[PDB]
Design a binder for this molecule. Structure first.
Ligand code: CL
Ligand code: CL
Ligand code: CL
Ligand code: MG
Ligand code: MG
Lengths: 359, 358
């Protein structure tokens, strides 16, 4: 069966810093031609990030072929939206990637490329909030509670929550959204350089951030201590980026009732070393588990016991960093529940694109 | 044929932004130490080795592009990677080396001696040996202290003479004997403070770009070098504690002449900046970047200078170099800093030719 013969279908590609994810969505539309019944009918993910690969024909051909070739439906519109990995590069370097990608799409006849472009972290934050609230079924009716969303990426992190329009705040950080006949005002912010890969490049020689005896590039040995690593990461959040100064006053005035996180935190929280129930965690418990299970354990033993976790060596650092970002940066209480979407649900911001081309 | 009358060696600098193959001819003095070191071949390729996908196809293409057209084979080769590879865990670096080893064991003209990631402290030692070799200061005991700075894409090094002592970590002190003389150096490298890695923390800072430059988040540049420098100094000092680590040692071991290599040579040599005698001061560098890039209208300035791919970054880079050298290292903003002309192709690889004989 091809659902796309009976329902509208589009393909959306999340071209993230650490990899690209193709989704094919089928949907119907209600009275205003707004999508409903959105279903993912195909998903494929590849590594590494599109902005990391050499921008020549042969490399981009291998990459796009790997991403698209085995898709069961090809004669549909395609949106290719890159996020913070491409935002790291100047517009001149990005142009080479889009020229090669445009050329590739023109060498074949099935996929109809609608747009290929780098979106801003503010657009990425709006799509993050739309994607999670569509899954929560909170978009069709006016809500009593405030839902905030966090997306933990490899190069940037987003935070987005309801906030009335404020003339003192940049226009770029505020979005007025009309969807399903309701009007929604959002604060959006993205912090470029505070994603997990970029942040980690500032702490690779910090012994407190690695399991005991992990080999640091300077020849010293890891000596893990999550509260100590967390204080180091907080200097990058607040002394450098001023996360606390920008976010805490706004959340004080516009409290969030439920927090949902997507991105890398879902993967860490779901791993064998951590234990959380009901797809929810607290920062207090995340930091204590990371400290006890990873930071204070012997690297050779951990490495041999978890040979499939390719991110294991960063788990002490990540536990520390997520705490630094959420508690010290955003001002979230260490005991506050944070929901995370299970990784097997393949939920990224791309559902937001399905919804908001129509609004 | 230069190698029929001289010893010859190939050294590859596999840096964060690309790899540079050098082939050197040399003679040796009475202790078999190199002298008369002459570059007889140079080839540079981009991007950095640690940035490419680690499969046998991609690595063969990369090594082929680097080595194929070399005029001389049948010589020892050192493949030394620096901070780009230091960004990767050993398990991922192992994939690169395993493939690279395969490639060399296959062919019969290059003689691979070693392929490894060198520490930042070793890179700093080689930085110091290469510059002093070129200055002709190694033959005899110097009356003066020469310090060297290497400004890379992912790490920066600093290295200067310091007498042996019980106080400082042995990990950052190096002793060598060369041309019959005993030299003791302090060495340090700061990973993540190279220009590429540093810049990823400030791309949405309007103070760090020309007026109306389009920032990735949709806001506009509004350049102000002093402000941009203050932002970069928080990463130098509040995060890395550069000042606390470096300034007490330089106070105790003052440097008479500073030489710099790496990205600063390319910036200072560009058409936007004006320096005489291949030397700059930090205050002049900051003033020039502020006037000639930070406070300019981006589209107009880009149209005036079409030939410079790095132009958009010059407000940030002038601010960053001042933050690192003045706020981090404690160098006086009016102190002369020599930079080696880029055309000279001086990286730390001459240090390897010298050090492997000691
Ligand atoms: Cl290092
Ligand atoms: Cl590649
Ligand atoms: Cl952004
Ligand atoms: Mg993402
Ligand atoms: Mg270098």
């Amino acid at each position: 069966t091809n659902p796309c013969e009976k329902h509208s279908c589009i393909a959306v590609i999340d071209a993230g810093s650490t990899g690209s994810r193709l989704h094919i969505y089928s949907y119907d539309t209600d009275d205003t031609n707004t999508p409903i019944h959105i279903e993912e009918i195909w998903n494929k993910k590849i590594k590494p990030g599109f902005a990391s690969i050499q921008p020549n024909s042969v490399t981009i051909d291998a990459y796009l072929t790997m991403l698209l070739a085995d898709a069961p439906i090809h004669n549909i519109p395609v949106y290719f939206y890159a996020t913070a990995g491409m935002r790291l590069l100047p517009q001149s370097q990005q142009k080479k990637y889009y020229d090669e990608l445009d050329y590739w799409f023109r060498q074949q006849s099935q996929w109809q490329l609608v747009e290929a472009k780098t979106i801003t972290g503010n657009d990425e934050a709006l799509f993050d909030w739309l994607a999670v609230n569509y899954k929560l079924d909170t978009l069709k009716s006016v809500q009593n509670k405030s839902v905030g969303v966090m997306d933990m990426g490899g190069a940037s992190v987003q935070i987005v929550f309801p906030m009335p329009k404020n003339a003192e705040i940049s226009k770029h950080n505020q979005v007025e959204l009309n969807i399903y006949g309701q009007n929604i005002n959002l604060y959006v912010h993205s912090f470029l350089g505070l994603g997990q890969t970029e942040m980690s490049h500032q702490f690779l020689n910090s012994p407190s951030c690695f399991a005991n005896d992990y080999p640091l590039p300077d020849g010293e040995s890891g000596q893990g201590n999550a509260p100590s690593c967390k204080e180091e990461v907080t200097s990058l959040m607040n002394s450098v980026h001023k996360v606390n100064q920008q976010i805490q006053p706004l959340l004080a005035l516009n409290p969030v009732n439920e927090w949902y996180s997507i991105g890398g935190i879902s993967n860490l929280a779901s791993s064998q070393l951590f234990h959380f129930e009901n797809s929810e965690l607290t920062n207090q418990s995340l930091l204590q588990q990371g400290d006890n299970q990873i930071c204070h354990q012997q690297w050779d033993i951990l490495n041999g016991q978890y040979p499939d976790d390719e991110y294991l060596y960063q788990y002490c650092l990540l536990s520390s960093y997520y705490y630094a970002l959420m508690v010290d940066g955003y001002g979230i209480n260490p005991n506050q529940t944070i929901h995370y979407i299970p990784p097997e649900q393949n939920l990224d911001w791309t559902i937001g694109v399905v919804l908001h081309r129509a609004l």
